[PDB]
Amino acid sequence: GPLGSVAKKITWRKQDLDRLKRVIALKKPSASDADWTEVLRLLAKEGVVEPEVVRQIAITRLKWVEP
């Protein structure tokens, strides 16, 4: 049924990543749950999982890298 890649109950697509990337450029977090709470506050509309996880997702998805 699903694609060949399991990862939570949220299929991170390019369309969903394109938006998040726009937030990371504005908020510009510093690798932290508290900070991610802001960027995730927007994408939260899509029922996104906790920020603690998204922190790593944006890395393996948006090729993000902590400072």
3D structure, described in words:
By secondary structure, the chain is mainly α. It has a single domain, classed as Orthogonal Bundle (Arc Repressor Mutant, subunit A), CATH 1.10.10. It is 54% helix and 0% strand. The protein contains three helices and no strands. It has helices at 14-27, 33-43, 51-61. It starts with 13 loop residues before the first helix and ends in a 6-residue tail after the last helix. It is found in: Nucleus; Chromosome, Centromere; Chromosome, Centromere, Kinetochore. It comes from Caenorhabditis elegans. Belongs to the KNL2 family.
Structure summary:
It is found in: Nucleus; Chromosome, Centromere; Chromosome, Centromere, Kinetochore. Helices cover 54% and strands 0% of the residues.
Task: Describe the secondary-structure layout.
Layout: H1 14-27, H2 33-43, H3 51-61
Protein name: Kinetochore null protein 2
Domain Myb-like: 6-67
Function: Required for the recruitment of hcp-3, hcp-4, knl-1, bub-1 and lin-53 to kinetochores, kinetochore assembly, chromosome condensation and chromosome segregation in meiosis and mitosis.
What are the key terms here?
67 residues, mainly alpha, Arc Repressor Mutant, subunit A, 0% strand, Kinetochore null protein 2
Strand content: under 5%
Major sheet details: none
CATH class: Mainly Alpha
CATH superfamily: Knl-2 Myb-like DNA-binding domain-like
Q: What is the tally of helical segments?
A: 3
Helical percent range?
A: 40-55%
C-alpha-based Rg, rounded: 12 Å
The topology string of helices and strands comes to: HHH
Question: Which structural class should the secondary elements be placed in?
Answer: mainly alpha
What is the CA–CA distance across the termini?
38 Å
**Total domain modules:** 1
Please identify, by name, the CATH architecture: Orthogonal Bundle
And the CATH topology?
A: Arc Repressor Mutant, subunit A
Organism: Caenorhabditis elegans
Protein name: Kinetochore null protein 2
Subcellular location: Nucleus; Chromosome, Centromere; Chromosome, Centromere, Kinetochore
Function: Required for the recruitment of hcp-3, hcp-4, knl-1, bub-1 and lin-53 to kinetochores, kinetochore assembly, chromosome condensation and chromosome segregation in meiosis and mitosis.
